[PDB]
UniProtKB/Swiss-Prot annotation:
Protein origin, superkingdom: Viruses
Organism: Rotavirus A (strain RVA/Human/United States/Wa/1974/G1P1A[8])
Ranges where the record places region Spike head: 2-160
Listed name of the protein: Outer capsid protein VP8*
Subcellular location, record wording: Virion
Length: 160
């Protein structure tokens, strides 16, 4: 079921597989785009961080985000834009003590986990071009087929 760990790389995964990323920095966890209507980058914020501006390179662009974390857990911020001439906004947050992040391509949508562990659930984001969405992963990752989502859900929420 759980294939991997696989080392950091760029590729475009098949549909119907969860990519489950074990984040190991407080920088950019992954960046994903089809260069048309879909850009998502996740940034990781360590526990107990007062509001502060931090610089991140995503999609070859230097960004400053105002960032905070009042929790005992890690916060993973989905930064999203739907066009190359928009700024990013914080579309989703995953508050986690597992440090695991999930991405799935399925049924015309991209699915990720958000909320707070151990009660994070999936959500979808629409796109007109799902097939050309690639991903750059900056950390070790695993592969779990959709068939076994309940397992991926367990991992996201309770760790490996």
């Amino acid at each position: 079921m759980l294939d991997g760990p696989y080392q950091p790389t760029t590729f475009t995964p098949p549909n119907d597989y969860w990519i489950l990323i074990n984040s190991n920095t407080n920088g950019v966890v992954y960046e994903s785009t089809n260069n048309s209507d879909f850009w998502t980058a996740v940034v990781a914020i360590e526990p107990h961080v007062n509001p502060v501006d931090r610089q991140y390179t995503i999609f070859g662009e230097s960004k400053q985000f105002n960032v905070s974390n009042d929790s005992n857990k890690w916060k993973f911020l989905e930064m999203f834009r739907s066009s190359s001439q928009n700024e990013f906004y914080n579309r989703r947050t995953l508050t986690s003590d597992t440090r695991l992040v999930g991405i799935l391509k399925y049924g015309g949508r991209v699915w990720t986990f958000h909320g707070e562990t151990p009660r994070a659930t999936t959500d979808s984001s629409s796109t007109a071009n799902l097939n050309n969405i690639s991903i750059t992963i900056h950390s070790e990752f695993y592969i779990i087929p959709r068939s076994q989502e309940s397992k991926c859900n367990e991992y996201i929420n309770n760790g490996l």
